[PDB]
Subunit: 248 residues, 6 copies
Amino acid sequence: QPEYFTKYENLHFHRDENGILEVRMHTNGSSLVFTGKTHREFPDAFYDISRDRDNRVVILTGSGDAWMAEIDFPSLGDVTNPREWDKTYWEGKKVLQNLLDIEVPVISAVNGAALLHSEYILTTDIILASENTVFQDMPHLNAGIVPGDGVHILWPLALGLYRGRYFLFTQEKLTAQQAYELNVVHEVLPQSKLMERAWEIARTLAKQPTLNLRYTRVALTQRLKRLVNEGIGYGLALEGITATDLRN
Amino acid sequence: QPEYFTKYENLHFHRDENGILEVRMHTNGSSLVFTGKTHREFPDAFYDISRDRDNRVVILTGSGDAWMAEIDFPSLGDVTNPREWDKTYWEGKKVLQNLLDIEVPVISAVNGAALLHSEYILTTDIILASENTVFQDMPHLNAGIVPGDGVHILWPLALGLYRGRYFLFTQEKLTAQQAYELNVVHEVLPQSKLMERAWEIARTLAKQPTLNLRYTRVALTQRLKRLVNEGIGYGLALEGITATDLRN
Amino acid sequence: NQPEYFTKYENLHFHRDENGILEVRMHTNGSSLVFTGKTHREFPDAFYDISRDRDNRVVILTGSGDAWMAEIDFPSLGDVTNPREWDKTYWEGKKVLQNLLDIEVPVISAVNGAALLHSEYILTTDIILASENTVFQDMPHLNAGIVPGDGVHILWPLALGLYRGRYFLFTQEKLTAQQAYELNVVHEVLPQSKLMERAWEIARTLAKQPTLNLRYTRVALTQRLKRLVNEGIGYGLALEGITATDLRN
Amino acid sequence: QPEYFTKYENLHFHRDENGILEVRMHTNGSSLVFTGKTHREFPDAFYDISRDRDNRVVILTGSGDAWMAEIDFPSLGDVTNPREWDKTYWEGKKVLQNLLDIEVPVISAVNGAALLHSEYILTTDIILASENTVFQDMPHLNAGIVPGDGVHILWPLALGLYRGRYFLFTQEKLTAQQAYELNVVHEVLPQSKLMERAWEIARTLAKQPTLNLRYTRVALTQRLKRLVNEGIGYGLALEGITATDLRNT
Amino acid sequence: QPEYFTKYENLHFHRDENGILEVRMHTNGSSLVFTGKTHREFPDAFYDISRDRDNRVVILTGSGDAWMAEIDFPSLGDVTNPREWDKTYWEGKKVLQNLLDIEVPVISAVNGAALLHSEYILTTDIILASENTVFQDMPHLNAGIVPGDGVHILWPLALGLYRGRYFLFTQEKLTAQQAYELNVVHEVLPQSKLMERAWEIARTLAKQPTLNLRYTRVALTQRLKRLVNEGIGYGLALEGITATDLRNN
Amino acid sequence: QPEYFTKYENLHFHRDENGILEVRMHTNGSSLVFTGKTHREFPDAFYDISRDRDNRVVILTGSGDAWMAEIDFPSLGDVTNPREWDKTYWEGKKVLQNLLDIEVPVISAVNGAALLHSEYILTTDIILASENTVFQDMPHLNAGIVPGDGVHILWPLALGLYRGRYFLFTQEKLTAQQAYELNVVHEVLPQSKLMERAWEIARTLAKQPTLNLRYTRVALTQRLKRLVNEGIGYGLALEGITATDLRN
C-alpha cells in the first residue's frame, strides 16, 4: 500500500482490488476529535488521495457513533491573533480546494452527528447517513465568529439561500430524515448497514471505465468549485476578524 | 432617536436597547398601499438603516393583515414614457442594492398577503409568516409588463429555476404552508404570535458580538448580491420597454 | 399559410393556432421518438427555426405515444470513438441547447411518458407538465461508460440541487412523475388523456399577454440559466468525447 | 459548392482546396452599404459558415476602399417602435453569437474605413488592416442612441476600460497605425498587399490538423463569448429605449 | 441650487444650464487633505450626485497643484481596532458602489499628483491630466497595509494584470505622459488649459439626449461594476487584518 | 533547511534570513530541459513552496542562457492515449493552481528564451527579463495540438484578446523590449545584472510585514485565479483530444 496510507494519525485507509478507498477519520480508533493537527494535515491527506490514480472511488466516513462532534478548541491555536489565524485561513482554503480536486466520485458515509466541518460532506457526490445522524453548524455562533469556512456557501446551496441562511443564523439541527427530505442525504440507513451500502454503491460505480469515473466527477464539480472559490477566502478572512474581535 | 426614524411617512421605526430595529410599512397605520412615493423613498430608507451602526438586527414587516397587497398604479407615474420609467428603473436598482447592503441579519415577519414586491422578502435571512399569508407576483402579468424588478431572479432562486418560472408565468399563489414546505418560509405562526416570535429570534441573535452579526450577514449575502446585480438592470429595462408598448 | 420549416423535419410535427401557440411534437413515423444521429444534427436547426419565427408566441414541446424519449439508434450517432466524428456530436450538442434556450417565448414541456435520454431539453423550458406514467432518468451515459456531459451535468443539479442532482446522475436514479413533482421539476401531474389539453389551456392564458411581454419575460427568466449552460456545456461534451474515444481501450 | 455560397446578395464566398474560405461583404460588387436586410441575413450567413465543417480557416473582408462606411438608415425599419426594434434586438444578439461560434480561426482583412459594425472585427483572431483604414463608432452618438450592439463590450476589451470608454464617448477615430500601436490591428499592409497577406497567414494555419484549428479557436474564445453574452442583450435593450425616446421632446 | 451642493465642506459644486456639474475636492480652499471625514462623507456625496437627474455630465477634479496628495492618517480613526476599521470597510465598499452608480458620463480632470485614492479616477469615463500629474499608490506600502480599497482591482484593469501588479507592489510613480502612453490618461494638458478642456468635452456630450447619456454610462460600466463588486469587500477585509497587525510591526 | 529544498532534481533552492527564496530551474546545472518528470514534480514543488510560511518573497528563475527553451517531448509519455494524457491533464491543472496559491509576492527573473511553459511567468507579480530573452508559444502548433495549458488564458490576458490570439495562432516571438512595451516585462537588464536586481526588489519587499506581503498577493491574484480556473481544464481536455487525433 502507498506510504500515505500510514502518514496520518487521524485517518485510516483501506482500498480494495477495484480501487475503492475507504478513508475513515478517527482519534485513537474512536470518533474524531478535531484538532489543530487535523486542520493542518487533512488538506495534505486529501491532496495525497487526489494524486493517487489507483483511487477509483472514495468513501469518506468517521468512526464510532459520531462523524464529527468533538473539537479540541485550544489545539487550533490562538485564533484571536491574526498571525495565527492566517495558518487556519490558508489551511481552510486548501482543505476544500484539495477535497474538491479528488478526481473520482466521493461517497460520504455519515455515521452519526456532524456538528462541525459538515462542509466536507457537502463536497461529496453521494451522501448516505445512519438513522442517528444530526447535522448542525455548532461551533461558529457558539464562539461568536463567522461561519466562514465554507458552510456559508455550501449549506445555502444545499438548502437554498432562504432555509440555508435560517439554518446557519439559528444553528438549526437537522435529523437524518429531515436532511433526506431536504435532498442533502440521499439514503438513510440503520447504523449496522451504512458501510455495507456505501461499499455496494462503490462497487457498482467501480464497474465504470476509470476515465468515465474521473471525468464525470470533473463535469459534476465545475460549478461547485467555482462557487466555493468565490466565497471561501472572503469568509475565512471575515471569520478571522471576528476571532480578533473576541479580545475587544 | 435618529432623525431618519421620522423621515418616512410609510415606515414606522422602533428600536430596543439591544439594537433590534423593527421597520413596519404602513399607509396611515393600515396595510401598505404601494405608491410612486414609496418606490422613491424606500431605497433611501434602506440606505439610512444600513448606514446606522446602532442597528444590530432588523425586523421588516407590514401592518394589519397584509404585508403588501395594494398598489396605487397612477401614483407610479406614466410608466409608458421612458423618461418617467427611467425614474422607476433607477429606483428599482437602488432599492435592492440598498436593502441587500443592510449589514446585519434581517428577519421578515410576513403578516399576510404579499402580492407585490415580495422580492424585498427574498433579500432577508430569516422568513417568518402568519398563517394567513399568501405569496404571488400579482401585478406584472395583470398589467402586461415584465416581472423584471428582481422577482425574475429571486423567485427562481427561492423555488429553483423550474418551479420559479412556473410560479411567475402562471401567477401562482402560495399559501404560508406551501411556502414553508418550499423552504421559503421558515416558521408559520398564528397572526397574534408572529411579531413576538420575530422579536424572540432577534433577541437571541442580538447576543452575538456586533461584528459577527455584520460579517455573517456579509458572508451569507455575497452570492445573492452578485445574482441580483447580474439581472436587475436588464429586467427593469425590458420591463420599461413592455410598459412603453402598452401604448401600442 | 404555414412556414416551410413546419415540413422540413421528418421527426418533428408542427401545429400552430391563430394565437401563435405552436405545438412541436417529436416522433418517428408517428410513434414515440427513436433518437438518431439525424435528430442530433437536425434538432438544433429546428429549434433555431422556431426561435427565428416571430409568429410563434408560445411553444409547447412534446413527444408521441406513451414515451417522451425512451429509445435511441446508437449506430446512427456515428463512430463516437473517433474524435473527428465525435466533434460533429460536440458542435451539435452545444448548438442544440443554445438554440433551444434562445427560443424567445415561453416554452411548455408536455412530458407524455418516459424521458430516459435528452431530458436536458425539458430542463430548458418554463412550465413542465407530465402525464402520470412519466419517469425521468439519465439512462444511456453510464450504460455506455461515457460522461453525462451533454447538459444533464448542469441542469439536473440545477433542478435537484448539487447534492441530489449528483446522486441522481451517478446512480442512474429513476424519478416518477410524483417524485419529480415533489422535487419541483414537474409542476402539474395529469392523466395521459388530459395532458395536452392542459398544456393548451395554459398556453392560451399566456397568449393573451402582449407579444413583447411574452418575449421579454422569457428573456428575463432565462438569463441566469443561459449563463449556467454556457459555462459547462462545451467542457462536458469534450470530456464525454474523451470517454467515447476511450471505449476503444 | 454549398448552396449558401449563393444565398446572400451582400456576401461573396470562395473557398480553396485547403478549406480556406473568404467571405467578402459587398453591395453590387462595391463597398457594403449596411441595410435592414444585411442586419437580418448576416446572422444566418455566419451560422451557415459555422455549420459547414469544410471551412477550415475563414477570412472576413469588405470590398473596394472601405470595410463598412455606409448605411441605409430607413432600411433598418422604424427603430423608434419597440415592436420593430425587437427584430433588431433579436438579430443583434444572434449576429455576435453566430459569428463567435464560427469554430475555426477567423482573419479580418480590414480593407478601409470601418465606421460602423466594427464589433464584427473584434470577434476575430487575427486582424490585418490596409494603410487607409480608420476605425470609429460613428453612428450611435450621431443618432443619439446607445452604442449597445457590442461595441460597448468589445471596444473596452480591445482598448481597455479607460481608452475604450474615451473612444466611444468622444467618437474617436483611430488610424490603422494607431490601432496597430493599441494592439487591435496586428499588421498594417498596403491596400494592394492586404489580401495576399491574409491568404498567406491562412495557408500557414491550414497546415494544422483540422481539430487543432477548431479547438484552438474554441479555447481562445471561451472568455470572449462569456463577456459578449454578459452585456449584449442589455446593451441592445437600452439602445432600443433610446431609439423610442427619439419620439419625445 | 440643490441643498446637497452645500452639504460637504470638502466638495465644491458648480452646475451649468446644460446640467454639467463640476465637483471639486478641497480642504478649506487648498488641495485636498484626505480625512476620516471625507472617507465617511464622500460616499453620501456621490450618492446625492447620482440621485439628482439634473446632473447630465459630471466633472470630478481637485484643487490647486495636486488632485490628492495628502492624508491626515490619525483622522481615519484607530484602524488597528476592527470595530473602527469596520466603518472604513463599510464606507470603502459604499464609496466605489456609489461613485460607479453615477448614471451619466464622468470626466476626471486630474489637476496634479494623485498619490492616494486614485481608484476614484479609475471609475470615470474620460481621464484628462495636467502635465504635472503623477499617479502612485503611496500610502498602503508606506503604512504596511494591503492596497485593498479598489486599487487592487482597478490598477490591474488599467495597466493589465502584469504591469498593474508591478505598479502596486513597487509603489511605481507614473507621469502624465507615461499614463497617457498606458491608455489611462486620454489627453495631457497644460495646467492652465485642463478645466477648459474638460468643460469643452462636457458641452459636446451634453448635446446628447438625456437618456442616451444615462444609458451609455450604464452600458459602459456593467463589466466594470461586476469587477469592483467581486473584489472590493475582500480587499478591504484583508486590509483590515493588516491594519490590526500594525500593533505587531 | 526544509527537506523539500533537496527533493527536486530540477530545482535548486536558496533562502536568505529575510525569507527571500530563490527557486532556480535546471537540468544538471544547465538550462532546464522540460520533461514528464518536471511536469509531474513541479506541481508538488510549488505546493511545497506555498505551504512553507518561512517563504516571504519568491524569485523564480532558470539557469544558463535560457529560461525554458527545450522539451523532451517523448518523456511526456504517449500523449495520444487518453489514459496517459489524463496524467498530463491532472498535473496541468494542479501546476497552475499550486503556483498561483503561492501566498507571497513572486518575482520572475527570466534569464533568456521562454519558448514553452511561459504561463508560469504569467502567474507572477513582477517580471524582470535579461536582454536576450524571447517569449513564444513554440511547442503546441509545432505538434499540432491545442495551446490549452494556460497560455490560452494568460497570453490574451497579458496582450489583450486581439494581440494575444494573434501571438498564439501565429507562434509569434516577442523580444524583451517588445514584451516591455507590451507591459509583460517590467524591467530589462543585462544578463549579469538580472539576479542582483531581482534580489534588490525582493529585499525592499521583505521589509514589509509578513501578513501585508501575503494578503497583498491574495488581493492581487483573486481575479487572475478565477480566470485561470474558468478555462484551464477545458483547454487541457481539448488539447488531449487533439493529441489523440495525432493517431489519425
